[PDB]
Structures are given as C-alpha cells and as structure tokens.
Design a protein around this ligand. Structure first.
Ligand code: GDP
Ligand code: GNH
Ligand code: MG
Lengths: 190, 190
C-alpha cells in the first residue's frame, strides 16, 4: 500500500485541529474540541489504487520549537495555515513557518492554507477587527504571499462550514504525488 | 506534455456545459450559454508537474447516438451527469449513459455527477416536481446507483454556486491518474 505524509503547521488557534477533525469525521468539533493534537489516517483512491493519507497535527507554541520539527521527517507536503481573520497568524507565516519548513524540508512542497473563511463575512468579527484599523486577510493578499514564498498554491476553507475543506486536501495529494524516477523524492529528511 | 482526457456525458439540459464553463472560467454563464460543443483545456499541477486537462463536452441528444462516441477514444475518465432535480436524467444514467460508455470504453473509469444541487432546496422546482408526482434525487439514492453501476464514486455540485465544482474535477483527476507501465492503461480505444 502506498502512503502520503502531510504535516500541518501554523500559529496556535488558527483552527488546525478543527479542520483536521472536520475533514476526517465530516463533523466540526462543536462539543469538547480535543485540546490535545493527534495523528489521523485516511484512505484515498488514486488511479483505482488505495493510498494511505497520514495527517499530522502539530503544536504551534514556541515551547515546542524544540520538539515540533521531530514530525517533519518523511513529510511529502506541508500545510502552512493561518486564519484569514488573524493578521498575526498571517504575518507569522512568512516570518516563522515557511522558514522552518524550508530549513529542514527544503525539497518538500507546501500549500498556503487560509482557515476560518466563514468569519470573513461575519459582522461580529470585522467589528473588533477595525479595532486596529485591520481587515480580514484577502485571498489576493494571501495569493501574493503564496507567490512570493513560493508555495505550491493558496487554498482556504472553513472547518466549520466545510467549504473548500475537501479541496484543501485534494490539492495536498496532487502536490504530494511523488515521481517514480530514480527516487527523485521531495520527502523530508533528518 | 503529460495529459488527461475527460469526456462529459449526460442528458441534454443537465448542465454539462455550464459546469464546464463555470469551472474553466470561474464564472457561471448566467447570460447566454455557448451553443457550440467545445472542449476546454486546463493546466493542473500534480506533484509539481504541469498536466494538461482536456475537458470534452458532448451532445446528449438521441440524434447523436451514432456520432457522440467519436469523442470517446483516448478518454481517461468520464463524467456521467444527471441533474439532482430531473428524474428522467437520473434514470437515463443506468438506462443509457453507463451502458453506452461501458460498451465503448470497458476499461475506462467514470464518476457519477449530480448537477444543479442548488435547486434541491428551491421551492418552485420542488413544487413543479411534486406536482408531476416527482421529487429531487437524494445523495443516498445516487450513491446507491453509483455503487451498483460501479462508478468510481458519486459527486454533486452546482455550476451556479460553484459548490463542490472544483472537487468534481479533483476527483476526476485522481480517478484518471494512469499507472506506470502502459500495459495497464485505461485510456479508451477503438
Ligand atoms: N439553477 C441552476 N441551473 C443550472 C445549473 N447548471 C446549468 N443550469 C441551467 O440548466 C439549463 C441547461 O444547462 P446546460 O449547461 O446548457 O445543459 P447541458 O445541455 O447538459 O449542457 C440552463 O437553463 C442552465 O442555465 C446549476 O448549477 N444551477
Ligand atoms: N468560525 C470558525 N471557527 C473555527 C474554525 N476552525 C477552528 N475554529 C475555532 O477556533 C478555535 C481554535 O481552533 P483549534 O482547532 O483549537 O486551533 P489550533 N490551536 O490550531 O489547534 C476554536 O475555538 C475552534 O472551535 C473555522 O473554520 N471557522
Ligand atoms: Mg451542453
């Protein structure tokens, strides 16, 4: 059986876990959201062949800067996430996450993922957003950052409404798909 | 370069073209629908590699039973479409469409595509439907037909709201992805 490793990174609270659960369980963790990350698997049919898709959540706290990279080995693709309603999370993508990923896994592809896009149109949100003359990160703004940082592409979604959620992982797979050629892989290595 | 041929079939008026245009132009032709039976081409990145995705529209009219199949050679995957609000279109999937592409392309994979899912919750349609002793097709029903007829999987969308539209073609690609040695090619032949 063939496998694809996808590590998910990003600032704390951007909705990494919710999007993983929502995707794997088809239901948004409205109840007790496991405030303790995990490791999931999904079986995906590609060309009529079954593939195991490993999804790895991570801890975004600085105190894990030491540990976190321990999961990177073997990753076929990364999901650098930021909330389209959190500028901090967005700026922190170029300053921290991309650099980190590129450092250890330089050949490993990554996608830029905007999360919680349902809160962009939300009134209650943009109301406390102008409380620093800021506005929701735009797709183009994000698309631009993606272009610059050289991400495979930009994708956003809502773990809550599940909008584009499936697509986020479809792209992950497409990007992850390795080359048969003399093991010309992009898999991360110690 | 590397290419994937996707032929789209289905009863007239299920929305094959609108879904093709909506996906390729990112805009639903709300104005007037292009009467010419065209084929489009999209470039898709798979494993960091550029692939050309050919999308071929067809004429579902009984008057082209003879001609229509002329576009089947080389197809990597088919999209058998029916509107989730047109029972006749759904019946014809098993009655006409699958039988036909199966006859011409026995080894070629296909997806079942429910179209116009936005109309499932539309009063007017639901009324007019119920009046003629009918009701919109439900995912379960379709999923069951997909299971029976042995479709790669069932997927629906709205070319109008674009919901699930990208996904329909993501699945098409995944399903189309051919195997290493050409001995196990699913590309339709004459
Ligand atoms: N509400 C709604 N109408 C649609 C949708 N897709 C197509 N249509 C309409 O369905 C009719 C036939 O669509 P068209 O693409 O020409 O059908 P085709 O002949 O199967 O290609 C037209 O009136 C379209 O505007 C959709 O997603 N939602
Ligand atoms: N509206 C909305 N809220 C979300 C979304 N994803 C996560 N959340 C909420 O955001 C908070 C942080 O999410 P969580 O998964 O714990 O984040 P982390 N720290 O990346 O694991 C939670 O309160 C959660 O319910 C989303 O897509 N939309
Ligand atoms: Mg048409």
């Amino acid at each position: 059986m063939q496998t694809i490793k996808c590590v998910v990174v990003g600032d704390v609270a951007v909705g990494k876990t919710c999007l993983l659960i929502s995707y794997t369980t088809n239901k948004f963790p409205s109840e007790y959201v496991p405030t303790v990350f995990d490791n999931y698997a999904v079986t995906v049919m590609i060309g009529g062949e079954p593939y195991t898709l490993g999804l790895f959540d991570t801890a975004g706290q600085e105190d894990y800067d030491r540990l976190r990279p321990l999961s990177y080995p073997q990753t076929d693709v990364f999901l650098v996430c930021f909330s389209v309603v959190s500028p901090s999370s967005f700026e922190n993508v170029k300053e921290k996450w991309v650099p980190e990923i590129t450092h250890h896994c330089p050949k490993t592809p990554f996608l830029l993922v905007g999360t919680q896009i349902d809160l962009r149109d939300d009134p209650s949100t943009i109301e406390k957003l102008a409380k620093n003359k800021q506005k929701p990160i735009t797709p183009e703004t994000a698309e631009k950052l993606a272009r610059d940082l050289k991400a495979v592409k930009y994708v956003e979604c809502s773990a809550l409404t599940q909008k584009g959620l499936k697509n986020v992982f479809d792209e992950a797979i497409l990007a992850a798909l390795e080359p048969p050629e003399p093991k010309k892989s992009r898999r991360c290595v110690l």
